[PDB]
């Protein structure tokens, strides 16, 4: 997250940490047994990581429950991006509690102008690279479909939406991918795509959740 905030300890109790040996992605706890995160994150061999703040110390309300099973969606294009969601199934249940607790799937669709929380430990760099260790947090407003895509003419379809800054300086980045937009408490968006970070008229790309909750209805319902 570039131009964010700290975003305090544990306040942001659905976010995960998808670790291969070392963090690699975010996501987002949707229930006892299951993640969503951005298909563009799958590694074979993820733990999940819940209850974290800083991610480089054992602080002492992490759990860390390795992943049975992941499911990319079945229209996931690499190359565009398009339908950029993945679940991750949990070996065992999370012990649901202040710290660690899901985050609502939508009902609606969320509405241009709406502003909401994206977080993430990815780099906190515009130029260069610098990666925190503690979470960061950034409240961005969902940008209308027709400045998304007069940003990225003949990329954007109806699964995803721009948020941020179209004077550049705060932003989603790398590191930050698969984890969380939520706005007006729900699951709104998945970090997914963007032209670097942060830059002039380049705002960030997600991927529109509220396209998906009947795949993840069902995925969940037979998995
Ligand atoms: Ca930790």
Redesign the pocket.
């Known amino acids: 997250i570039v131009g964010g905030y700290t975003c305090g300890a544990n306040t942001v109790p659905y976010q995960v940490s998808l670790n291969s040996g070392y963090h690699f992605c975010g996501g987002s706890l949707i229930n006892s047994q299951w993640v969503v995160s951005a298909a563009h994150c799958y590694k074979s061999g993820i733990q999940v990581?819940l209850?974290?703040?800083?991610?480089?110390?054992?602080?002492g309300?992490?759990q860390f429950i390795s992943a049975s099973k992941s499911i990319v969606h079945p229209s996931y294009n690499s190359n565009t991006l398009n339908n950029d969601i993945m679940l991750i199934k949990l070996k065992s249940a999370a012990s649901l509690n202040s710290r660690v607790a899901s985050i609502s799937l939508p009902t609606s669709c969320a509405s241009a102008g709406t502003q909401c929380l994206i977080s993430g430990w990815g780099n906190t760099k515009s130029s260069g690279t610098s990666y925190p260790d503690v979470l960061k947090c950034l409240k961005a407003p969902i940008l209308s479909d027709s400045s998304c895509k007069s940003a990225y003419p003949g990329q954007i379809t109806s699964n995803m939406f721009c948020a941020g800054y179209l004077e550049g300086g705060k932003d989603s980045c790398q590191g930050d991918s698969g984890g969380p937009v939520v706005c007006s408490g729900k699951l709104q968006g998945i970090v997914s795509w963007g032209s670097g970070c942060a830059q002039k008229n380049k705002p960030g790309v997600y991927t529109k959740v509220c396209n998906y909750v009947s795949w993840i209805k069902q995925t969940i319902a037979s998995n």
């Open positions: 990581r209850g974290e703040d800083n991610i480089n110390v054992v602080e309300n992490e």
